[PDB]
Amino acid sequence: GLMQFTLPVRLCKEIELFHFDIGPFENMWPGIFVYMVHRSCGTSCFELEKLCRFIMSVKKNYRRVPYHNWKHAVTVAHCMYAILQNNHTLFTDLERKGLLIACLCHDLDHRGFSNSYLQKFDHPLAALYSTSTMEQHHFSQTVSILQLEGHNIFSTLSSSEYEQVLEIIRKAIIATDLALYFGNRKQLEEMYQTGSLNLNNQSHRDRVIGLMMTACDLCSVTKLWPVTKLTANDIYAEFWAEGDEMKKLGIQPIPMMDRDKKDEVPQGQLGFYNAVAIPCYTTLTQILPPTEPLLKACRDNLSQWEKVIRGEETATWI
Ligand SMILES: O=C(Nc1nc(CN2CCCCC2)cs1)c1nc(C2CC2)cnc1Nc1cncnc1
Ligand SMILES: [Mg+2]
Ligand SMILES: [Zn+2]
């Protein structure tokens, strides 16, 4: 009850910053998460013993893939921590509880393959869930772990608070399907500019939490350049394996996924920053001004990719 998590000084200070990298010591990531829950939520939010058991079953259900792994889960949860700590008074008690858990669980049992690949493969999950295929699976795995004996971290909530928090987690996890992000951001753009955006309107809060989930999910493009560049390598290791799997189904993959087209990566990163990431952090920053550092860091990384194209610097891995 009086048992705080404390980090070394460098981490205690840098964990507050948006561009924090959780480091290469896997055994420290659970304590980093619990530190963030304790400071974001309270030391009373969860029973420590149940939270620790929950965290360790979540870790076990992330696979050893290059990018959609346990390190990504914790990284996405940290970006949510930093957004919540910079916007203290905007979010409900149930939202603080739900959203860190949503981020930790948002890619549970990811196999390193896109929704597209599962549908072309004719995977059974593509018959069970016709849209947002992996994201419905991630939510389903979250509910499974929550129902394991001793894993119910929400056990002290009323029946209606429990339904509400699981509904926050379901929408937050579904929102990480980037297919849904484009229309969500367009609507948030119109709402903000015509001045109809209303944080008391539940359907408005839902849209804003969705955009927060996209922002946290993509946050590897908001790190210092050496982190972003080395993380780009991991996500392309997945993209290229999926492309290989498309060639095995007799389908030419898109270039992003074609390892014979490594030369096209710098230009593909430009399209990704201009079409997805910069617009995401731009609209986030309009709704939640204290999240501006994410936009600034994203613009810094677009500028490094522009330098890569002008040959003023390299990748190696390209
Ligand atoms: O590059 C990415 N996606 C990419 N998408 C393309 C294709 N492009 C998209 C925009 C419009 C034109 C077509 C190229 S790279 C990417 N995607 C995700 C999620 C959407 C799956 C997460 N992180 C990504 N990159 C990254 C870079 N550096 C560090 N960490 C992550
Ligand atoms: Mg995902
Ligand atoms: Zn993710």
Side-chain angles (χ1 to χ4, degrees), residues 260-267 318:
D260 302 324
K261 299 190 174 165
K262 290 199 199 187
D263 35 288
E264 293 175 41
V265 163
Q267 200 68 43
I318 305 154

Side-chain angles (χ1 to χ4, degrees), residues 153-220:
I153 60 173
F154 293 124
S155 72
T156 76
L157 268 41
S158 66
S159 179
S160 75
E161 288 183 300
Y162 185 102
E163 173 141 25
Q164 282 180 64
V165 81
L166 265 287
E167 198 55 16
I168 291 169
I169 289 161
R170 184 184 66 76
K171 292 166 182 162
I173 294 180
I174 296 307
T176 61
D177 177 12
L178 200 69
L180 302 179
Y181 150 71
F182 297 98
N184 186 55
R185 191 203 65 87
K186 274 157 209 147
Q187 283 270 228
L188 276 176
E189 200 54 32
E190 298 172 21
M191 276 171 200
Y192 164 86
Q193 292 183 353
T194 72
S196 36
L197 185 57
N198 173 28
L199 294 171
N200 296 328
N201 178 332
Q202 189 55 51
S203 65
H204 286 198
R205 279 189 95 64
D206 288 354
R207 291 203 173 271
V208 171
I209 293 157
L211 187 68
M212 289 167 62
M213 291 299 298
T214 308
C216 299
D217 196 17
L218 297 193
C219 77
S220 284

